[PDB]
From a paper:
Methylenetetrahydrofolate dehydrogenase/cyclohydrolase 2 (MTHFD2) is a bifunctional metabolic enzyme found in mitochondria, exhibiting both dehydrogenase and cyclohydrolase catalytic activities. In one-carbon metabolism, MTHFD2 converts 5, 10-methylene tetrahydrofolate (5,10-CH2-THF) to 10-formyl tetrahydrofolate (10-CHO-THF) in mitochondria, thereby regulating the production of NADH, purines, and pyrimidines. An isozyme, methylenetetrahydrofolate dehydrogenase, cyclohydrolase and formyltetrahydrofolate synthetase 1 (MTHFD1), performs similar catalytic reactions to MTHFD2, albeit localized in the cytoplasm rather than the mitochondrion. The key distinction between these two proteins lie in their expression profiles: MTHFD1 is typically expressed in normal cells while MTHFD2 is abundantly expressed in immortal, embryonic, and cancer cells, but absent in adult normal cells.
Superimposition of the MTHFD1/16e complex structure with MTHFD1/LY374571 complex structure uncovered several differences between them. First, in the structure of MTHFD1/LY374571, the nicotinamide group of NADP+ was hydrogen bonded with the NH2 moiety of the triaminopyrimidine headgroup of LY374571. However, the addition of a chloride substituent on the phenyl ring in 16e induced a clash with the nicotinamide group of NADP+, leading to the shift of the nicotinamide group of NADP+ away from the triaminopyrimidine headgroup of 16e and the consequent loss of the hydrogen bond between 16e and NADP+ Instead, NADP+ in MTHFD1/16e structure was found to be hydrogen bonded with the side chain of Thr279. Second, in comparison with the MTHFD1/LY374571 structure, it was observed that the addition of the chloride atom in 16e led to the rotation of the phenyl ring by approximately 26°, accompanied by the movement of the γ-carboxylic acid away from β strand h1. Moreover, the electron density of the γ-carboxylic acid in 16e is weaker than that observed in LY374571. The shift of γ-carboxylic acid in 16e resulted in the loss of the van der Waals interactions with Leu51, Tyr52 and Tyr240. These effects collectively contributed to the weaker inhibitory activity of 16e toward MTHFD1 and consequently improved its selectivity to MTHFD2, as shown by the increase in the selectivity index from 7.9 to 27.1 compared with LY374571. The γ-carboxylic acid of 16e adopted different conformations in MTHFD1 and MTHFD2. In the MTHFD2/16e structure, the γ-carboxylic acid was positioned toward β strand h1, forming hydrogen bonds with Ser83 and hydrophobic interactions with Tyr84 and Leu289. However, in the MTHFD1/16e structure, the γ-carboxylic acid moiety shifted away, leading to the loss of these interactions.
Author numbering:
A (entry chain A), B (entry chain B): 3 to 242, 251 to 296
C (entry chain C): 2 to 246, 249 to 296
D (entry chain D): 4 to 240, 251 to 296
The structure:
């Protein structure tokens, strides 16, 4: 059976390294501290949970994180005002808008996201940062935090990515599409699948590397997995318990390496956000 | 044998149609013309040819196209003076920098391209337009002209794209990477290959749709082709004669539809540029 | 448990020291004489710039005059052919090579260019003449490609006789894999050659008492495949993206597992790489000595 | 075990070549393919083989001249004849029958490598060998015995790519070019020779097996892999091959008899290359 990729343990190493890094910055530049802001619209329970998890990690590391929660009935004009203020506040080094917005009024998510200054866009969701990533200009952009965490998990196997066939199932702005770009510029041959893909099972079977981000619980069957594959399950699905987008039991029999759910991608996503935040803070000093 | 996709004929139809739009807009808004500018650094032979073809097309349609040719000794800051000037000239509706820059100095191509105002970026090469396309926001952006042209050639076959498996060989900023995005958001399942892909022949054979943009003369062999494939060949190679990146003679015995070289993608690239220029002229009027 | 390391960095240094002393003696025995190598480059590929510079530095340390001729990517075939003719006829140039691949805007027939090199100056062993002599076992009338030369020296460093053993070569390229097969064969190994159309590569690899890998596919050859006790020679130099560095160099062999199965193994970097350069200097010195005779 | 009948197969190649030579003569009147065979000494085996080749050329319509130099020929005298055959625009291909039988010490390598590669229809020059051994198969002459062996293997209809082939013998004229030829048809190839340990086990790996050792019936049928394609190049004097034919026939799926197997194919491939050098000259 597969080696388990323990996201809980790996993310802990990353947070301790960031913690010590932040401590050293404070020693070298007294009074300085990385500052994150999280903006939310509405009151979705899962958004509440994930934001709380992010605040706890910021606090462990010594990043000052402020959470601003606007009600369901806010207007796009109201959110734009807050984004402008965060852009202009020079003590805020990065900030993000937790998605999806949960609003009674139609609010243009792409307009809201794209008002974020690219230098503070630690979620890497602006068009500017996406376009840098999608075209291989990887050193001047924030990369979205879940693809970053997935990449670090793949690298924990010690198997080089270059030349491997990687399959990404899902193409969302937040996970699937940036994952494809990250694997491409790590020199994998990449196939991207979606809801219009036919013969998904045969596409999945091509992947030496498989990243699944669909939101469909255990829809990717273990019998489809290429023997020896590295399997990265981004799913967090609540069912009659938490399960991933991959059928874990059968997949684990065939994979060389696999992420458990929970304790896999989830903690790595949060740790990567903290890493990007520390990076913007260091960039701000210089 | 495959039906020939005749880009030379298809483009003529597009250009004749564009001329009618331009004539119609000239009488509906008197004294108004679409205005294009093409900036060149250095004196490459192929760049000279391609710029000349674009000027020819713009002349036939009624677009006022200017060609600024800077010497090989141009600095990055001299280039930025022209880009800044073109952004600010309200009479210029779109402009592009022919690539690659041929300068004996070192010029950050990315810094130059990304100084172009996005609403004049008729080549779709800025990060902003690339990020929109790469995230599926296809109604807000300029799409690179060679991908635009390849999509039109594919539609001319009448075979729907949704659910087919598309293989793109090459990932360049100008062609291969935007070709992947355009096919993906037309709901193909897409594999991208490059110089590090292993078993390229096996990977090419999965493509119901095959777009080759490698700059390697006749490198993709006909034996590799999936029987019945739609074969789109972007290569323009001068060999001991002009050949594409696909071995055309034997690929024709396998494809259901194939683009010749010359007379395939090339003229479509130019027509699609004139289309985007007219689109930004109409956009400017509102 | 772990395999002994074939330290190409140390071994190549012993070779260059030896060549240094014997070029210092040649410059005394025949005053005013300097062994001279030319490197012809078309284009400006970044990896080619590094390997050329690494070769020039080795030449300079030993006392070889090495001339880098870099033609722009606009160069035509007939223009390259004029340079090669010029180096063929320049009697102060004892060896020269064309760094491959050529990086030109124009298509240049690489075989035409390479085979125009005079075989007695073909210190890279790339002409069809030198390849034909090697491939038919006529080893003392030819220049052997530098990477296979370095690999053979690394193999002999083990102290393990080659005759009788089963050798597996993964890769059949003109520069490395095919001349490697010939060199092992005429050293009396039984030799199996693998490539991209080999089925059960893992089983074929498992046959190799001697294993030479030259595929350019990073760590594709799994350690689990390695025959226990094998001598493992890794020719791979693969630059894999690495945002913690911005890349790193890895071999064609998964070293961390392979070294628990092999008796001897080359690390990457520091293995075949420096030996390749040391062998070029050795062949260059040999061609200068042959010029005097 | 099916029988690869070189005598029948070669007859078809010679008939195909014959008509091909007839059509060529009708298209360019007064033009015929011309071969020259040079011999040093008077070995009986070479007299026989050269005669068999001359006869094949006559059946097809190739004009072949045989020049036989004495045992006391010098290297210099042989070189004069090669220079003349190179410079004779009438001659499209020529070969030197090997081994040279000379009282004097003559460098065979030197003699062979003075042949112009465009006329080297035996493929024995270092130039043609280096093209073949590096996979540039499109512009060289492949030695005739390996050419014929490959034709025999293809006659089975079993594809070569991905099969494991074993070659026993590494000689300049058969074994070494035979390895190259199978390799660039994408077999995985093992070469064995007189220093190969456990030759029995090695031979057992071959889906394709070519034996070119000159050791009468040394390869035992018990060694053959069941279903193997067995190609026997041996001509050992009764005449028998290098494979124990009776036992090997109970294991192989296809097998060459000796005589009537490779032997006829070798001669037909030389004629094929001669006709081919005549076409290249016509342009
Ligand atoms: N920290 C973390 O672990 C983390 C972070 C973010 C998200 N996630 C999780 O990842 C999962 C997906 O998230 P998302 O943001 O990517 O959501 P999303 O916007 O709903 O995207 C779903 C994607 O999956 C595709 N898909 C749906 N059904 C499919 C099917 N039957 N076959 C193939 N593709 C199919 C959709 O295809 P179309 O494009 O054709 O609709 C779409 O591209 C969820 O469980 C989410 O919580 C986890
Ligand atoms: N109107 C038109 O028809 C039109 C318009 C624009 C361009 N083009 C043509 O499209 C072609 C593009 O090539 P270029 O060199 O000019 O651009 P380039 O920017 O050098 O891109 C070459 C792409 O092909 C890949 N590639 C190179 N060798 C390969 C191989 N052996 N196997 C697989 N992939 C390989 C490269 O991979 P890496 O990324 O790994 O290096 C890269 O992604 C040219 O012929 C160009 O003229 C045509
Ligand atoms: N000093 C040194 O260390 C040194 C010097 C020179 C070169 N090199 C290195 O040697 C490596 C290869 O270079 P090269 O010129 O030999 O490369 P190449 O021309 O790209 O050839 C690679 C060979 O490997 C084979 N191959 C590819 N994938 C395979 C697979 N999955 N299974 C089996 N065989 C496979 C190919 O098979 P096909 O033949 O069927 O295509 C081909 O023969 C590179 O890392 C290069 O930098 C190192
Ligand atoms: N027209 C035809 O059909 C035709 C044409 C030419 C030749 N032939 C025949 O083919 C046979 C071989 O000819 P050749 O020119 O190749 O002869 P050769 O030059 O004597 O070569 C014999 C090869 O077999 C190897 N060998 C000898 N004993 C061996 C053993 N016990 N185990 C393994 N390998 C062994 C030798 O190995 P070493 O290299 O280690 O000595 C050598 O490589 C002869 O019978 C010859 O007449 C037939
Ligand atoms: N702007 C914006 N909008 C978004 N929707 C996202 N997505 C997002 O935050 N996802 C997300 C983040 C963290 C977890 C998580 O915490 N998982 C752990 C359990 C707790 C632990 O970490 O200890 C586990 O599974 O083990 C799970 C998820 Cl789905 C974003 O990133 N940016
Ligand atoms: N900024 C920027 N930089 C770039 N380098 C490009 N690329 C580009 O212009 N390519 C390009 C454009 C046209 C042709 C062509 O005209 N081909 C015709 C022959 C003439 C005809 O009849 O039209 C044919 O093949 O038949 C061929 C090519 Cl390669 C770009 O688009 N933007
Ligand atoms: N004509 C022609 N064309 C070619 N492309 C080649 N190949 C070639 O030069 N390869 C090559 C050479 C040297 C290195 C290297 O620097 N290796 C060392 C580090 C420093 C050291 O050399 O000491 C290490 O890995 O530790 C790496 C490589 Cl890939 C050729 O030989 N002839
Ligand atoms: N330059 C050079 N030198 C060389 N020594 C060779 N070798 C060579 O000719 N060998 C050779 C050739 C033909 C036969 C033969 O006659 N075989 C048939 C019988 C009748 C028929 O040929 O049809 C059979 O056995 O059935 C047998 C052999 Cl050993 C060469 O090729 N080139």
């Amino acid at each position: 059976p597969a080696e388990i990729l323990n996201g809980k343990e790996i993310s802990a190493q990353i947070r301790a390294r960031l913690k010590n890094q932040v401590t050293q910055l404070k020693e070298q530049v007294p009074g300085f501290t990385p500052r994150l802001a999280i903006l939310q619209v509405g009151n979705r329970d899962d958004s509440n949970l994930y934001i709380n998890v992010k605040l706890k990690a910021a606090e462990e590391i010594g990043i000052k994180a402020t959470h601003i929660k606007l009600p369901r009935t806010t207007t796009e004009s109201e959110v734009m005002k807050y984004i402008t203020s965060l852009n202009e506040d020079s003590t805020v080094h990065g900030f993000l808008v937790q998605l999806p917005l949960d609003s009674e009024n139609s609010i243009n998510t792409e307009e809201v996201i794209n008002a974020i200054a690219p230098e503070k866009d630690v979620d890497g969701l602006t068009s500017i940062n996406a376009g840098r990533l999608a075209r291989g200009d990887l050193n001047d952009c924030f990369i979205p935090c879940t693809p970053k965490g997935c990449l670090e998990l793949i690298k924990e196997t010690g198997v080089p990515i270059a030349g491997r066939h990687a399959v990404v199932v899902g193409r969302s702005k937040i996970v699937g599409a940036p994952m494809h770009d990250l694997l491409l510029w790590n020199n994998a041959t990449v196939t991207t699948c979606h809801s219009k893909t036919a013969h998904l099972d045969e596409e999945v079977n091509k992947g030496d590397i498989l990243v699944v981000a669909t939101g469909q619980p255990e829809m990717v069957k273990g019998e489809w997995i290429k023997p020896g594959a590295i399997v990265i399950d981004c799913g967090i699905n609540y069912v009659p318990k938490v399960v991933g987008d991959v059928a874990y039991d059968e997949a684990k029999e065939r994979a060389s390496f696999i992420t458990p759910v929970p304790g896999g991608v989830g903690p790595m996503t949060v740790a990567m956000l903290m890493q990007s935040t520390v990076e913007s803070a260091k960039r701000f000093l210089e």
